């Protein structure tokens, strides 16, 4: 049987100890060294005023520094200057003053929120939509001209409600508008970004008519924190050689046999390839080049591991049915692998329709229109149904195989010595993996729920320990060590 | 000749039960009652349509013979007594075509025309009028003040094919003017290239329903003595015969009730101390 | 101009002005927005944050008294300074506030390594280092001033809503990001108005650790309870606002107007301090029947409408 069937309890114990030491180190690295996953800076947009010269000639408005725009503090100041819509531009400068953005901030999110003011004569219409004429540009040094990156209409729906009674006693109070998503970029590659938002209005077309009275536009810039990416890459540059060593060792130990590998060994190796796909730090090329597709590639690279591991569990449970099958061909697993394959492909199509489309329009988001919303929700629902169906199949398989194990165990003394060792080792080998996998899955879910409710920090003694970053690094270390132990312990003798 | 498009005085006492259809759009609608009120001039000629529940939406309507005012003068008349002296509540009428399913109507139903005093809050006390036109609901430019007290008062509206109108209250004119000069139907003349006149402003294709759908906080007010016709003189003489006959009797009777109240209050103040 | 025209600053405030010179316009904006809210919240209550152009005391002697009105003024001014400084940091006009470090090679908790988290503290920091500086002298007035100022700052600190956005595997919430969102300053106005209606009176006490006297305030714990850093406090009874009296700093209601018809927002029969509740009716001229864009200068037609002037004696 496999090497775990031959390993004495002492050597298995020392292996477990080494694995746990590496586990705790992988938790600490994110806990103490890493600076936490994401920043969230909040900019107030500065209401520049167009000089009316720009009929067709295009120029960019800057909130501060040299050549700052003609500026308005309170939007009411437009009225006695006789300033009108189509002339007020909500300009935003992305790195706050005396700062820079560096490619280590592997992405940018931006989401809007509007300070719409209630007024009895200008309430929001029931299905109002904002039609921003957004344009964005980048620059690389504090004196070069801005060069355009994007210029696109960005319609959005106003989900806004008013909590105070609709009485003239409460005019001027803001609506509680939700955070409408705005833009995502898969890689920062330039030092400064300038962003202009305009709200042109036309009564006949009803573009931006009846959206209420907007006092200010608030824009929140989210990015992966600069030190966390360096910690992540320092971890990946350690895991890559280790997994390559384990892969070459496993491949040699598989090929160097009289018999060809069984299906379990093939799927173990495939899981290894999928994970060494994740470990290879090809993200470390993104700090030099301007590759916008990095986020989509990362998402597909992670999905290929999930859809491989979920299939590995089923293949493992199937390959331990003790009797009446003993077949090795993959085609017998259609009923079980089909659900996860279909779910994975469907969720991949959804992720394409959002993230890959965003490559041509950074402001796109599928949740804007009802057709897109319904299609994306159909894909997500099909994925969820496939996942639940798969999980039911997995629970049924585990129940059936424990049925087989109990039945066979009621007859172990009867057959020969070597066959008795074979079957008892099969029982132990299966139980070991299921206990380890239950421990890892339960621990991952527990630390995931903790990362959802925690503040993001924990004060211990004189130091602060990151919880969110420790979670990411710890779970990544957990499943990497899980794959390592799986490869080592389940190779042939 | 005076065409009686609609008319009612509840002289039968029970004709309301057949002529009016209440809306069942919402289950919590207030229910009207027929009564002459706490003070009146006539026992039966003043027994009108009364609101009875506080803080309710109301929706009552009655159908009438279909007609069109194209090439004809339009007249509407009704009388109201504000028994409770509302601090907020509607006191207006709506007219509808025959397409209105009276079982389902509500405040958002599409009417042809709106007319009546509107009293909600002491800050605004102006008579409310709204005419539908080519998908637009348009309201008056100039203002007309409504009456204050609980006494029974008469209201009347008049529209002419010459695109002119006039408002009659208590059988007396209160306002007159031209439709396109007092409503924002058409774009302003200034020569603006989009401008072109439309004589069809004063008329609608058809009418078949008179409706009373409204909100009130204080109930108690009563509505009576309705008329829809083409003849201004018929409306004037009907208003005289239906309101001038009661004016003096109701005045005297509520005056004597107020005097009785003053006697009772002053003698209670004398006895209490 | 810096730290020269402004007359009333105490030496800590001069040093703060000389160091954080760029912040001072934002502090003036915060004072202005706070005073606007204190005018709005009391536009009926017999006293409506009336300003006087004397420039030595822009409200007159009345707010020097340790009364609930001065309590509200101090609380809303502190909240306004905090809000305006936070907004100005958000606009990016202020280069001083928060983290301002350009580059960090080794782990150094700067921008390029740790991001920025210290920004959200700046409004409270500047408001407390500015407003509380003049209230160091240990009088009962100053103790009340400090408590009310902290109450104003905690009002802003309490109403910051937490909002979250998430991203990850395929847009799922495995990576979640959250930030604090500023509250609308009208909401803080209503909240401080509610606190003003529920302000607690509490009495003065005197003692010192050394040979001398130092003052502190003692709550009226017989019925009510005052939570620290949350509720406004005062120790001087508010004067009657009916008659004009420059000695106490109160201006009469001889020119004020109210909802005379059938009621009064705080009692028209009371706040008018007399009889005669109507003075004129005016044909006000105003824009009407407008197209109403979302912003400004609708350039619409105009008309005149009659309004009743219930100015009362
Ligand atoms: C001075 O003194 C006092 C107190 O000190 C204050 O005066 C009032 O105080 C009270 C207390 O809050 C308030 O008045 C009323 O409060 C009640 C609370 O429930 C409400 O009943 C009432 O609500 C009306 O107005 C609100 C405005 O938000 C509406 O939401 C509500 O639906 C009520 O409006 C209906 O009723 C009005 C009168 O009946 C109609 O004029 C109005 O159009 C609306 O009617 C609808 O329904 C009918 C039939 O169902 C339809 O025909 C209507 O359609 C028409 O209008 C629509 C829309 O324009 C068009 O689409 C359509 O074409 C038309 O046909 C409607 O669909 C009050 O809130 C209030 O505070 C004060 N009253 C006021 C200001 O009027 C005062 O505040 C104090 N202070 C001061 C003055 O400063
Ligand atoms: C139910 C709740 C379950 C929640 C599960 C989510 C756990 C969080 C995992 C952290 C994500 C992660 O580290 O991905 C790594 C591998 O990811 C893996 O290979 C871990 C496999 C997790 C198995 C989940 C089974 C749970 C059973 C049920 C690779 O990620 P990356 O592409 O290299 O970069 C992403 C970095 N970032 C996340 C900061 C963007």
mmCIF file of C-alpha atoms in Angstrom, chain B residues 122 139-140, chain C residues 261 289 305:
data_model
loop_
_atom_site.group_PDB
_atom_site.id
_atom_site.type_symbol
_atom_site.label_atom_id
_atom_site.label_comp_id
_atom_site.label_asym_id
_atom_site.label_seq_id
_atom_site.Cartn_x
_atom_site.Cartn_y
_atom_site.Cartn_z
ATOM 1 C CA UNK B 122 -52.962 76.929 7.530
ATOM 2 C CA UNK B 139 -52.494 73.460 -12.632
ATOM 3 C CA UNK B 140 -53.490 77.115 -12.544
ATOM 4 C CA UNK C 261 -52.461 80.689 12.897
ATOM 5 C CA UNK C 289 -42.802 76.774 -12.442
ATOM 6 C CA UNK C 305 -47.260 85.219 -4.572
#
